[PDB]
């Protein structure tokens, strides 16, 4: 019961990053309902599908520098490189905004030299 008391204190009244505690899948909400001599919890969740193979390289090279992302990852179709989040594909063009820099790009492994649009220069043109 207590366990069933925790859910209506964790899963129903809120969201919990825990797995298999508020149902199968990345929890989103939990609508409860009754029983004769028990409780029931209806867990709504997030089930990914329609996958797609991509190719990765964690960091990128430019000006000899190494830039990393902020939230999401780096992928590439065959020729282009894009940045997107880890649980949905909605790709974007790389920028000096959606990344950041630390170090020289001779140490990270798996790197792939690329280019960077930067949204300031033409604003100077």
């Amino acid at each position: 019961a207590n366990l069933a008391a925790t859910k209506m204190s964790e899963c129903v009244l809120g969201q919990s990053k825990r797995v298999d505690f508020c149902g199968k899948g990345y929890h989103l909400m939990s609508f409860p309902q009754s029983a004769p001599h028990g409780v029931v919890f209806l867990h709504v969740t997030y089930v990914p599908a329609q996958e797609k193979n991509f190719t990765t390289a964690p960091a990128i090279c430019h000006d000899g520098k190494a830039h990393f992302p902020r939230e999401g990852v780096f992928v590439s179709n065959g020729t282009h490189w894009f940045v997107t989040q880890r649980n949905f594909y909605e790709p974007q063009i790389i920028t000096t905004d959606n990344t950041f820099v630390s170090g020289n790009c001779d140490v990270v492994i798996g790197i792939v030299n690329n280019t960077v649009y930067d949204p300031l220069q033409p604003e100077l043109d």
């Binding site: 029931v40 193979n53 990852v73």
Partner: protein, 40 residues
């Protein structure tokens, strides 16, 4: 009729690990489940 068999755990599947391979979804999907628990 009847049968007696060893237990199947599931479908043997293999993944394409690689130092340059990821996988990301494109469409989501919702599920609804039931965790029945007693109280009384």
């Amino acid at each position: 009729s009847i049968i007696a068999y060893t237990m199947s755990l599931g479908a043997e599947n293999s993944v394409a690990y690689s130092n340059n391979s990821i996988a990301i979804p494109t469409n989501f999907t919702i599920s609804v489940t039931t965790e029945i628990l007693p109280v009384s």
